[PDB]
Write a protein that binds this ligand. Sequence first.
Ligand code: ZN
Length: 35
Amino acid sequence: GSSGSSGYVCALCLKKFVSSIRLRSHIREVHGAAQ
Ligand SMILES: [Zn+2]
């Protein structure tokens, strides 16, 4: 396997973030996966 990508990226909007949490909540406010 190959390595590279360090940061985290959304699975829907495909947007990169600073940390995991910052991305998690983003999906709850932007994507709101708490339906
Ligand atoms: Zn997103």
